C-alpha cells in the first residue's frame, strides 16, 4: 500500500505482497564527487499507478486545459527530473540501491528452492535412513548388484 512520491507514482507495490525487499546502502559505487546525475524519476502524472506497472513515457504532461505542442511553459510540464545526488547530501539523502523480489505460485512445476542434508552415512548399524524421497530403517551394507545408469 503506502503513499508518497514512490510506490505511488513510479513503482507501485501491490498489496498482498509475495516477495522479499532488500535495500543495502551505498555511498561509493554511486554518488560520484561533484554530483551524480544519471537517474531520473517521474514528477507529474494524470493518475495513479495500477499494481506492477512500468510507466516509461517522455510526453510532456499538461496541467491546465490548453493543449501544448511540445513547449515547456505554463500548464505543460516535463515530469522527468534528476536525482540530486551529492557527495555529502546527508544520511537521509544517500543513494540507496533497492532490490525487490517476487515469489509466485500457479498450476505449474516449481523449479527454484534449495535443500541441504549432506550428512555422512554409516554402515553396519541399525540406522534410520532418508534418501531423496524414500525413508526407512535398516542396516546399510555394500553390495555387488548392478544397476542400469
Amino acid at each position, epitope marked *: 500500500g503506502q503513499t508518497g512520491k514512490i510506490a505511488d507514482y513510479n513503482y507501485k507495490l501491490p498489496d498482498d505482497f509475495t516477495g522479499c525487499v532488500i535495500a543495502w546502502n551505498s555511498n561509493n559505487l554511486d554518488s560520484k564527487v561533484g554530483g551524480n546525475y544519471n537517474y531520473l524519476y517521474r*514528477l*507529474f502524472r*494524470k493518475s495513479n499507478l495500477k499494481p506492477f506497472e512500468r510507466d516509461i513515457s517522455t510526453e510532456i504532461y499538461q*496541467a*491546465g*486545459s*490548453t493543449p501544448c505542442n511540445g513547449v*515547456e*511553459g*505554463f*500548464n505543460c*510540464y*516535463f515530469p522527468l*527530473q*534528476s536525482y540530486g545526488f551529492q557527495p555529502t547530501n546527508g544520511v537521509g539523502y544517500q543513494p540507496y540501491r533497492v532490490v525487490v523480489l517476487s515469489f509466485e505460485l500457479l498450476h505449474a512445476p516449481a523449479t527454484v528452492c534449495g535443500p541441504k542434508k549432506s550428512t555422512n552415512l554409516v554402515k553396519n548399524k541399525c540406522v534410520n535412513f532418508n534418501f531423496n524421497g524414500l525413508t526407512g530403517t535398516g542396516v546399510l551394507t555394500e553390495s555387488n548388484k548392478k544397476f542400469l545408469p
Partner: antibody
Amino acid sequence: QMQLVQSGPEVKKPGTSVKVSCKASGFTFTSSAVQWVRQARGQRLEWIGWIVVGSGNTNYAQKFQERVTITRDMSTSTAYMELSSLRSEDTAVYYCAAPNCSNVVCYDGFDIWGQGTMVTVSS
Amino acid sequence: EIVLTQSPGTLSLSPGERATLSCRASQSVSSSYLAWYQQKPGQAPRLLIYSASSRATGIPDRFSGSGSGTDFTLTISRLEPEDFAVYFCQQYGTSPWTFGQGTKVEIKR
C-alpha cells in the same frame, strides 16, 4: 477560504539582499508555479522571474538573470525570493503570483496574488 | 522584440461607455496565454480575463474581449460608475513575459 500570504515591510541598505516568502494555503501548492513581479511608485508593471513548485524549472528575465535566487522548499509549501546587491533604483514593491490549481486541473490564470511587500534603500 | 504597447492612453467619459481598449502586439503570439489585470491604486490587481476568449470565476457586467494572433482588445459595455482603475496587459505564451503599458479611465465633469 483560499488565499496567499506574503511577508511584511522591508527597509534595507545598498549592498544587501531581500527575502520575501509566499505562503500558499487552501489549495494543492505542489502542482503549481509561482511568478515574481515588481511594481514601482505609480509606474508600469514588470517581470522578475518564475519557478515551479514541482522543482527543476526556473526561468528568469534577461536583466533579472543574475543577482536573484528563488528558493522554493517543499516542507512548508511556500516560495521565497532572494534578490542580492540592492541598488537605489530598486526601492519598490514586490508582489506574488500563483494559479488556483486543484488536483486534476490547474487554473490557467494567476488568480491569487500576494499583498506585496516593499523595499527601500537609502542612507 | 516583444512589446504590449497599448493604443489608448487615457479615457474620460461618463458612466456608460463602449470602453474599447487595444493591446496590439508586435510579434505573433498564440491567443491562448494572455491575461488582463485591473489594478485599483492602493491594493493588488485582480484577474479579469484570460486565454483571450474566456471568463473568470465571477465578473460583473459581462466583460467581453477577443482578438487574433497580433490583435488584442477588450470592450466594457455600459461602463459602470465604480469601474475606474488601471488596466494592464500580460502575455505568458513565450518568455520573457512583458507586461502591459497601462490605461486609465475617469469621469467627465
